Amino acid sequence: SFIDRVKALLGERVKDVRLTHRLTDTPAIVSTDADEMSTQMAKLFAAAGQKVPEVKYIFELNPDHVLVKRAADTEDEAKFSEWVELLLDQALLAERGTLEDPNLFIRRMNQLLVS
C-alpha cells in the first residue's frame, strides 16, 4: 500500500502519514497536533538563542494530485524515494518558509526535471 510504503520510508522523521482530500494544486501538506511543539513555537526558541526543540510533523498527501498519483505508481525504489523526499521538503518549505538543506531540495528538483 501507498501510505504504508511512505511510512516505512520516512520512519520516525514524521509523526504520521495520512491522505487528505483537501483538494487543490498542493500535493502535500504538513501539520502538528493540538498540544505538541508547533513550528511557530519552535521558531520562538531559535529566536531566543535556544536550540530548536524537535517538531513531529504529520505528513498529509493529496491523492487527487497528479504528482502524488505518480509517486504511488512508481515501482522503482530510488525513484519512489526522490518523490516522497521532494514532496516532504515541499510541504516543509511551505510550513516554515525554510529548509534545513535548501540546496539538496534544489538539487533533487532539477534531477527530476531533467530525467
Query: Residues interacting with its own copies, by CB under 8 A?
Result: 25-27, 66-67, 90, 93-94, 97-99, 102-103, 105-107, 109-110, 112-114
Neighbouring C-beta atoms of residue 85, cutoff 10 Å = 15
Question: Which of helix, strand or coil describes residue 47?
Answer: coil
With CB under 5 to 8 Å by kind, the binding choice for 48 among its own copies, Ni ion, none is none
Q: How far is the CB of 34 from Ni ion (least distance, A)?
A: 25
Q: How far is the CB of 3 from its own copies (least distance, A)?
A: 21
Question: Which of helix, strand or coil describes residue 16?
Answer: strand
CB-wise, 61 or 67, nearer to its own copies? Answer: 67
Q: d(Cα 84, Cα 75) in Å, to the nearest integer?
A: 13
